[PDB]
Amino acid sequence: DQIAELLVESPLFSFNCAHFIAFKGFRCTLHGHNYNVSLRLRGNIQGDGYVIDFSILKEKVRKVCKQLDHHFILPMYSDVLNIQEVNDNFKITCEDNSEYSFPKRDCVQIPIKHSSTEEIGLYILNQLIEEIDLPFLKTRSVNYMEVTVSESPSQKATVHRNI
Amino acid sequence: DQIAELLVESPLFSFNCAHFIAFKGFRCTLHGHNYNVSLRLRGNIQGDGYVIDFSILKEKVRKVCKQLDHHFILPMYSDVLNIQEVNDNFKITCEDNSEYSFPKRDCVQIPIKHSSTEEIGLYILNQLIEEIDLPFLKTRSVNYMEVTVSESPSQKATVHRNI
Amino acid sequence: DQIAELLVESPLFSFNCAHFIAFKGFRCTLHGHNYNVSLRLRGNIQGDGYVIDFSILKEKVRKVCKQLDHHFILPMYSDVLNIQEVNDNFKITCEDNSEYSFPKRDCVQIPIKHSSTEEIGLYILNQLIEEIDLPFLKTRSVNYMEVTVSESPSQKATVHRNI
Amino acid sequence: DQIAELLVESPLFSFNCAHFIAFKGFRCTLHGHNYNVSLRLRGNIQGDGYVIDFSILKEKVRKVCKQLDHHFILPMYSDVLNIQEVNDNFKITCEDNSEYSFPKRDCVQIPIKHSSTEEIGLYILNQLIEEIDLPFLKTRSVNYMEVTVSESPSQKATVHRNI
Amino acid sequence: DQIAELLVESPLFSFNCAHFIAFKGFRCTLHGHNYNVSLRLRGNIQGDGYVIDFSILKEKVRKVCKQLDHHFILPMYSDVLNIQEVNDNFKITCEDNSEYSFPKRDCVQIPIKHSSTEEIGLYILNQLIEEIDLPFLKTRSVNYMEVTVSESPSQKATVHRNI
Amino acid sequence: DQIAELLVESPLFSFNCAHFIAFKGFRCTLHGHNYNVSLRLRGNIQGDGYVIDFSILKEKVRKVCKQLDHHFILPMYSDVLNIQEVNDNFKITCEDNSEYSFPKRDCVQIPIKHSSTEEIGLYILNQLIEEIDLPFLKTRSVNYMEVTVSESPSQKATVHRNI
Ligand SMILES: Nc1nc2nccnc2c(=O)[nH]1
Ligand SMILES: Nc1nc2nccnc2c(=O)[nH]1
Ligand SMILES: Nc1nc2nccnc2c(=O)[nH]1
Ligand SMILES: Nc1nc2nccnc2c(=O)[nH]1
Ligand SMILES: Nc1nc2nccnc2c(=O)[nH]1
Ligand SMILES: Nc1nc2nccnc2c(=O)[nH]1
Ligand SMILES: [Zn+2]
Ligand SMILES: [Zn+2]
Ligand SMILES: [Zn+2]
Ligand SMILES: [Zn+2]
Ligand SMILES: [Zn+2]
Ligand SMILES: [Zn+2]
Incomplete structure (x- = not known):
């Protein structure tokens, strides 16, 4: 077989959210970002000529992004x-002792x-694997999934899982 | 003389802010954006070989952006x-009847x-002209100032003033 | 009132098409492109704070692009x-005397x-104005519509109409 | 020695081609793309200060691209x-039972x-290694060659070979 | 007739040069830039379907750039x-009283x-019009030529001539 | 723990320098570039939710770039x-026997x-690790540092160190 690595990345894989950073001895002010998500994966090229169809990757990245988009991101476990x-x-x-109040419907509570x-x-990596479906990934021979999230064009974090 | 038009544009001319849209019969949820500002101007090339020094344009766009950056944008005249x-x-x-509450220091009240x-x-166009200084612009022969603001890479608004 | 100019531009405003150039004494080979469309317009800022909602511009550019996308572009009036x-x-x-044959359903016949x-x-300019709707544009005070089409990132044509 | 990894990538490393996807139980319509090729390689920095001269990489990527450019891509082994x-x-x-016909000279038959x-x-990876020349790569200490092909800015595949 | 405006812009339209700024009471240090040139023009769409062929624009921008590329830019009239x-x-x-010395062949003397x-x-605007040829432009109905030069992605100057 | 990889990259991480290539049997002419630096690192996400604060990475890349910026780059060990x-x-x-002369203050002597x-x-990789501070990196669990330098958008070299 032949290994190939697919990348999907787009201005559409966006979620425009408010948030603020707080950790011990530090709190930033409320602000926001156009977050962007890219997905990279590795598998073997299948008899149909694809590792996995790009259209499915695009559909599911859009889906996960869309749940977060236009909300305040609220951590659950801070x-x-x-x-x-x-x-x-x-x-x-x-x-x-700073205080904020938002309509619950304007917030997306995320287990972070x-x-x-x-x-x-x-969080997105775990959600993307659920949405695309892990058994479906393994039928396509996918063995590696990697998500990059950017909070602005100049600052990105990348996480992966071997599957 | 020779007319020239200068453009300065950069990922640095950014303000990462939260906001929400509300107008009659409509309210969106709280969210945010990496806003980006470009500035375009027209004047004659001066005896020093510049219409105006790019460094001053960059300094002042950064200054205006920095006042808005990391805040909730609050209109005054809604x-x-x-x-x-x-x-x-x-x-x-x-x-x-949706309700929000923010620390005043997390908000930037803007006359919009x-x-x-x-x-x-x-608003930025008016502020940039104040910061660079209108009389100083006219000493450089600048007769046109134009600001583009993007709320994401795919949606921009552009306004100008003849001076 | 205040004039503003809106620009919408995106990798989504795409149509991936085959075509070939032929004019008197010249024929190129069959090939293709990821065409991209941007739209720029001018109107006054309305009481709701928009010249016109970006979402409608994005919806309609996508619609026109989608009709052309994944087809051979066939001129009607060559x-x-x-x-x-x-x-x-x-x-x-x-x-x-070169000859080509395509399923009619793989072709989009365009009055060019x-x-x-x-x-x-x-053609796109005329279609976009029909899709967004000319009377609707005039209710928003839009007086200028301009389309840029790129056949690759390095070669673009821009056309406009005063309305 | 010191390992370095070189990347060459450019709007010039393009081939604007028509194609269509067909595999069992599926056929898309004829369309096209501005394909783009990047090349990444790893070797040791040589006594001349380069792993290998960028100019040679650019010359040969352009050459391979140019053979495919402005043609219908026709698989040999479908x-x-x-x-x-x-x-x-x-x-x-x-x-x-859909049927197409193209001048042979408008087509590039590729062993895929x-x-x-x-x-x-x-295919490009194999051709690039032939064009740059495998023995020449090994004289420069290159031990890894990797090609990324994009069919549009948002969808890429990457393949490599250890040499 | 129908007006159209063509833009050609590319990482290829580059000249990688050294220079330094000096004017009365000011001297910067020697440094350099990847300058980039775009060209925009306006004419009527001709019976062949082009305002003017993009290939000729690309050929001539490349030619002018290539004369400046890999040199120290030396003004003649400082x-x-x-x-x-x-x-x-x-x-x-x-x-x-700062002093520099360069091989004449490493320098490009420009009437600026x-x-x-x-x-x-x-200077480039004047050269591009000479290279493409003014009478040839007028046969294509071109009535406006505009050059943008960037010294880095964030700082550009644009000049034009009505012809 | 969870591994994450951070990338910082920006038009600000620039140094606009003159240089020329010379090695045995070869000398290019004096010219220049807008060099750009990106930094990638790997560590575990810390109890504060960051591998390391992006702001510190940005501060130190800017610092190293700023030392080189606006100078002729002079190798020490050629x-x-x-x-x-x-x-x-x-x-x-x-x-x-080509000869050049520059004010020492216009030159940055680099141990290359x-x-x-x-x-x-x-050189930059070694300097960035010194500036951010190796012991400080290890307190953040960083185990991998990687620098990409581009001399123009189309040609980059990437080096790393396991720490
Ligand atoms: N993986 C993959 N998916 C695709 N989907 C649609 C069109 N082309 C492709 C393609 O070339 N590769
Ligand atoms: N306007 C202008 N400003 C500048 N500032 C610094 C360096 N170059 C320039 C330049 O070429 N033009
Ligand atoms: N015209 C316009 N449309 C919008 N649509 C959605 C969100 N913001 C906007 C905006 O700021 N301007
Ligand atoms: N590999 C490599 N090749 C080059 N070719 C021309 C100029 N600089 C370079 C350079 O810095 N590195
Ligand atoms: N002006 C112009 N020139 C071209 N050259 C080659 C291919 N297409 C084109 C095109 O569509 N327009
Ligand atoms: N590493 C890291 N640093 C940051 N600095 C400021 C704001 N957000 C962040 C962030 O999300 N991650
Ligand atoms: Zn933030
Ligand atoms: Zn918004
Ligand atoms: Zn074409
Ligand atoms: Zn396709
Ligand atoms: Zn300079
Ligand atoms: Zn160089």
Whole structure:
């Protein structure tokens, strides 16, 4: 067989989100980004001439991005935020006693500790593998999946999993 | 004399901000963008060989961007937001009764009606002309100033003023 | 009022097509391109804070592109091609007696003389104005529409209409 | 010694071709692309200060691209196309009985099964190594050659060989 | 008739040159740039379907660039440089008594006062019109020629002539 | 733990320098480039949610670039240049007896043999590790550092060190 590595990357694989960084002894102000996601994978070229169809990769990256897009990204497991449910809002209180409140529907609660590029990348990697489907990946011989997330064109984090 | 048109554009001329769109009968969710600003100008080439030094354009675009960067962009003159001062926060209430609250220091209050690309462009154009200095522009023979603001690589608004 | 100029441009505004150039005393070989379309317009900023919503521009550029995408572009009005209907194919004969045949369904017949970037740009401009809708443009105060078509990143043609 | 990895990539390393995808139970329509080729290699920095001269890499990528450019890409080993020689044309018949005919001189017959990005990448990799010359590569200490082919900016396949 | 505007722009339209800025009361250090040139023109679409063939524009931009490429750019008409011919070198003395010497063959003497982007743009515009040929432009109905020169991706000057 | 790989890359990580290539039996003319530097690193995501803060990477890449920027790059260890100190200049004599002279302050003397992209990359890699600080990198768990240097957008060299 012949190994090939596929890359899909596009201005469409975007989610335009608000967030703020907080960790021990530090809190940044609320702001936002046009995050962008690329996906790279490795498998053998199949009898149909593809490792896996690009169209499916594009469909599923778009799907995951679309869930995050146009929301405030809210970590679930942060040790430095107090996240309160107040009526139909999340009220967030930082260690410096700064306070924020957002409609719950404007927020996407993600099982991460920090809304950093790195942790968001790991989350997306796990979601992309679920959406494309792990058994389906293995039928295509895919053995490696890698996600790059950029928070702006100049700063990216890349994570992978051997499958 | 010889007319020349200068363009300065860069990933540095950025402000990474949160905002949300609201106008009559419409409210989007809180989200964010890596806004980018380019500046174009026209004047005659001076005896020193420049219309105006690129370094000054870069310094001042960076300065204006830096004031907006890492904040929630809050319009001052919106007819569809109720903006309340609560302790050290701005509490914002929309026509659909959605409610937000942010530390005032996380917000940049801008004399616009909507945090649209177009209105933000007009605001930046006016600020850039103040920062570079209008009399200084006229000493360099500059007669045209134009700002492009992008909210993402695929959507830009451009405004100008004849001076 | 305040004039603003909007630009929408994206790798999505694409149509990946085959074509070949033929004009008097010249015929190139069959080949293809990832054509890309940008749209620029001018109007006044409306009470909602937009000249016109970017989402509608993106929707309609995508629509026009999608009709052309994945087809052979066939001119209707060429003076140097003999275009024959043979069963469910178009058979095309050039002045040098070169012959081609394609399934009609693989072809998009366009009311142009040459599949040049310039003529394709004029065709798209006319189609985009129909799709977005001319009366709707005038309600938004749009007075200028301009299309750029690229046949590769290094060669573009731009056409406009005052409306 | 010191390992270095060289990358050459450029809008010039292009071939603007028509093709169509066909494999069992599937046929797309005729269309085209601005394919782009990048080359990456690894060797030790030589006493002249280069792993290998960039100019030679650029010359040979251009050469291989130029053979494919402005042609229909025709696979030789497809199990789902019937490729007939008719006078000075290739007549191609698909499993759904769709029929195409092209002048042979407009076609480039390539020893692949599918005109997919992956198979085209393997073909180019093999050709680039022949053109630059394998013994010449080994005199420069090059031990790794890798080709990326893009069919559009958003979809790429990458193949390599250890030499 | 139909007006169209053509743009050609490419990483190939490059000249990698050394220069330094000097004007009254100012001298920068010797350094260099990958200058890039784009050309924009306006004419009517001709009976062959082109305003003018892109290939000719590309050929001639490459030609002009190639004359400047890999040289020190030496102004002829500077009021602040003393340019001496010493054996087979140019010895250049600045107002601060700084001194440089280069082989004449490493230098390209250009009829400008300052090696600024603006003056280099005017020079290239004049050369491009000579190379493509003014009478030939008028046979194609071209009435406007415009050159953009960038000294780096973030700083460009644009000059034009109505013809 | 979770491995992540960070990339920082930007038009700001630039140094606009003059240089010329000389090695045995070869000398190019004086010219220049907008060199660009990217940095890639690998470590584990720390309890603060970062492998290492992007801001520190950006600060230090800028610092190293800034030392080289706006100078002639002068190798220290070339076997084919005769480098003489003459008053406040370096006079450089090549094997073909070509002669150059530059103010010492316009030159940056770098401990390399050739001003090639590869050797400049190794030098920058070593400097970046010193500037960010090796012990500080190891506190962040960083185990891999990699620098890419481009002399123009189309030609790059990449070097790394396991730490
Ligand atoms: N490593 C890293 N650094 C950062 N610095 C500032 C903002 N975000 C980030 C981020 O998400 N990751
Ligand atoms: N015209 C325009 N349209 C938009 N659509 C969605 C979000 N923002 C915008 C915006 O800022 N301007
Ligand atoms: N002006 C122009 N020139 C061209 N040259 C070659 C191929 N296509 C074209 C084209 O579409 N337009
Ligand atoms: N993997 C892969 N997928 C594709 N999907 C559509 C068209 N071409 C392709 C192609 O060439 N490769
Ligand atoms: N306007 C202008 N400004 C500059 N600043 C620094 C270096 N070059 C330039 C230049 O060429 N033009
Ligand atoms: N490999 C390599 N080749 C080159 N060719 C020309 C100029 N510089 C270079 C260079 O710096 N590296
Ligand atoms: Zn952020
Ligand atoms: Zn928005
Ligand atoms: Zn073509
Ligand atoms: Zn295709
Ligand atoms: Zn310079
Ligand atoms: Zn060089």
